[PDB]
């Protein structure tokens, strides 16, 4: 069994890791017939789907597909940073296989936390 | 597969995009027999339903109809801005097919606007 | 005539903008028969090709395909920041149609550099 | 034969000199069909193209169009000051006919 | 289409990946008749050629052979780290099919 | 065969050597029809062209004219000292036949 | 196929290796009719040409190599040259750092 | 199906509504090869085109492009107020997709 | 053959007469792909379309759809009173099948 | 060739002249399948159609039917006095074959 | 190419100019089979036809014949002064080849 | 893409702009074989044709030639001011490539209308 | 036949356009043997000759050379703005082939600027 998303991703053909360290920019969901799907975007222009169940999914994946859509919705609404996505790159948009969330404090976010410690000390 | 709500909407007859860029004003839900439905309103007076599950829905849409009602409820309670709705305009109220939510608000841009108000007051 | 890479990208089917504001992480080039191509990667995991010249290219594109590979090589070797790529998302890896380079100090990054000059002068 | 970019510019209809005395802010290039072009910008908001080769170019200009795009790319990457551009003002963006680089 | 040099290399017979993670030690180029070739070496003693264009090359490779020699020359002069070479191990020196450069 | 630019220059009519021992002050290039040319200037006011390729050039000179414009551009951008220019003084501006660069 | 410039040079009759281990002192190029040539010199006093013209491309490449070597001050290790020409004519160049 | 120009505009990428509530200031039309186009201007300086028919148009649009030019000409000649234009903002001038007239 | 718009309307399923006795308040027309349509409104808030030509139209209707859009545009520009519209009420907006204009 | 509408009308079976010397009271047009027609009325109660085009009408008459509908619409909108109609009396309503307008 | 209607008319056999300097008194149009024609009259009693399209017309004339009928109808309805008609005098009524309108 | 008739005109050989700011004086149209053309004149003596369709026209121009004749007829009948014509000067009469209409004769006419409002107020 | 000085200039070898948009600063004329010539200067330091009639002139040019000297003299004496000179740059001073003079700033536009200065002072 793999111990992280990168090792998990390497067990499948036609997959790659995207490292975003960013919150979701947009969340789209459809109940329309044959398009019961979710789409997320990031500021950098990356677009990802959770595929419509049917075609190419085994029974054990049905619950995990529904869980992924719940995860993306609550991540979007809480502005949770997505660390990595494992995706299938043979689909358009690229299709989510796995997600990691970690709070990796952004580049100028350490200089904004330090001008909030120096700004709440002077005035 | 479509990459966004506008392309998704164009795959169906009797649909249109409403651009709201606003949070939901009201959320209504019913468990009454033959009216197991949700209704949302916006400040501008727009009214939308999630239809009662019925003969016009295929089996794959049952879970997506339940998910849409979960999405609208948590969006209402968190005051999330709705960007667009794709709706069937041959129903009254217009019936939701898809929803997009977009997060404009720049994360550390609210802490940079607040250390520009605290920095142009002390020194 | 388009005025920028975003307008240029919108003139084609199956394209999207990626905003990277990052230097190229890796540059790969092949002279092997039927794989006369280049591949670039970014730290974020994004992979892009310049396609093998083929039946989907018109004669006008031949010189521009060779120019794009020259541009990517010199950009890699000088660590030039890539601002945007316009790519075809119906290819795997996504295929480069256009590139913009600007050394763009970010929006709130100019107000963070100015509250680091005003903050290292008071205390 | 003209001795400088200003005299060269005056030999063509629908041209004007822009004096920038600034390095290129952005360099854009496309291999997309019918948009095999370059676009440069300056900090001041000025936008210029090297046109797609077309029916308004004579055969002798094909190599010079390719050379101009090489020049703009290496100028961008070395932060060379552009002194002047001679451009066609009947195109949007204005289309580069000539470039001078001086002592920046 | 492959996504990296290792997958590209595996599509051909008689090829292998060398991982160098090192800059080029020497660049040699010849204009002598029937030896219009380039040779690079690494500190570890590894020697690689860009083959003389010949009957084993298809027309689409002609420009890519010239590009490879340009790439090796500018890589040598800028001391760029070569990550991997895909080479034909059927030739002596081994003949370059592909190069990857990574920081 | 001549061994330096001065001996090379003396093989042609209407040529002279200018000794600059200075980097190029300005580089101008045109893609305008019938003016596909380059112009360089020096601080001392000297102006030189690479002529538009034309009926006064033989086929072997076409590539050398393109090479000269590449050389002048990279010389300008690297601030390389130009030692001497061999030019045709029959043309206005004087037209470059050869360039020497020494540190 | 030879593996270095010295073995390559030994495959031809009129050739010799010069070992310079020095950067190029001067670069000269001409576009004049029948003298489309390059001349390089070393501090040592050594003078070499790329002669006036698939060897067509290699002649053009050699002149590109000598120009960028001159401008980057790259050390030239060895030249293989034809000694039946004056100046001696470049057949091959090796650069080692 | 949309019920108004604003909803219609939202069904396309790279579009926006301009509200003019003004008559057309100028009408320009061309029969020249590869420029078979119309341009309208408003007093406020806004410029809009009906694009040359091209590869970005499907067959069903050919008649509608001709109708739009008829509509703009009769609107200009009758001084009809244009309420809104839906336009593609990735073109210069911005390219008309739809027009509404009220009042 | 029917002698008036009301009798014509009664020959089709899913149609109804609207009596407006009013000029058109707004005229909207689109050349966008798959939305090659017209929309008219009246002061009372009523909205009507000329449908995109499609699989529900027979060949003879192509010309009549183009004629209807010409009629609505010239009616709007001349402020002609529309007497009645025959429309399909199974479309949103309701889709025009016929128009009458009466001078008195 | 006849020189007026009355002589033209007399060349056909099942036709007659109506003299109206009045503008059109109502203009009706339909795009409904198999009813692609126009109906005009006069204050005196006279009703006339432009017949549905079809495949059993000669090609020259299909174009003239389209012209007649354009003529009736612009006549209605300008309140032009209709002098005479030539109509086929074997159709109900009587079907327009020709129209004359005098001031 | 002629510069006015009088020079145009003189290029054909069997033509003459009528100078009317008057608006059209009557406009007649027919969709009856083999009489798809227009007839105009002037107050002075002059009668002119646009001929039925037929074997004496070349393909380039088809659109121009339809344009002439559009021109005569809009001229009649706007009371535009007709300056001159170029007509074929070997037809009865005389057949319109060209029209000029001036003021 | 050009932005106005003057830029459009400069894209062609053998063309020039005439600025008329005047209504059409005469409209002539012919259906005679090989002279299926229109001729307009202005009071100043300028004569212009819409050329007979021929071998010098590409297929895309056919509809635009018919449109130009419609435009000239309705312009004549409404007395619309023609601002500019782009014409080919290698034809006799000069042949129309483009027309602009604007209701101007403004420029110093707006400062003459304002010194007639200031002059009928003082004396 | 060319339509302007720029097209005329492009028909000759060793010519260039100078744009002066200025009146002539000096006029010099000589009747001395073998120097029967004119020289004009501009404030910017530009010097131009009308060449001595000679073996490089065809018979047709004799009258035009005399006319050019008449034109330059009357232009000098009336302070007429010279727009452009087409000159041979293989002669010292550069030798005049053609001259353009352009007007612009309108006749009654100087009396409209003066009844706007007299009208915004009284009433
Ligand atoms: Cl005859």
UniProtKB/TrEMBL annotation, chains D, I:
Alphabetical GO CC annotations of the entry are:
extracellular region
Entry-linked Pfam families: Enterotoxin_b
Question: Where would you find the membrane-spanning parts of this chain?
Answer: none
- Give the signal sequence positions: none
Protein name (Swiss-Prot/TrEMBL):
Toxin B subunit
Which organism's genome codes for this protein?
Vibrio cholerae
């Amino acid at each position: 069994t793999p111990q992280n998303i990168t090792d998990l991703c390497a067990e499948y053909h036609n997959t790659q890791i995207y490292t975003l360290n960013d919150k979701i920019f947009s969340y789209t969901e459809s109940l329309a017939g044959k398009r019961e799907m979710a789409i997320i975007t990031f500021k950098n222009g990356a677009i990802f789907q959770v595929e419509v169940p049917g075609s190419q999914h085994i029974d054990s994946q049905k619950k995990a597909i529904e869980r992924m859509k719940d995860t993306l919705r609550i991540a979007y609404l809480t502005e949770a940073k997505v660390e990595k996505l494992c995706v299938w790159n043979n689909k358009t948009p690229h299709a989510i296989a796995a997600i990691s969330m970690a709070n990796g404090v952004s580049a100028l976010e350490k200089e904004v936390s330090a001008l909030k410690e120096k700004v709440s000390a002077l005035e």
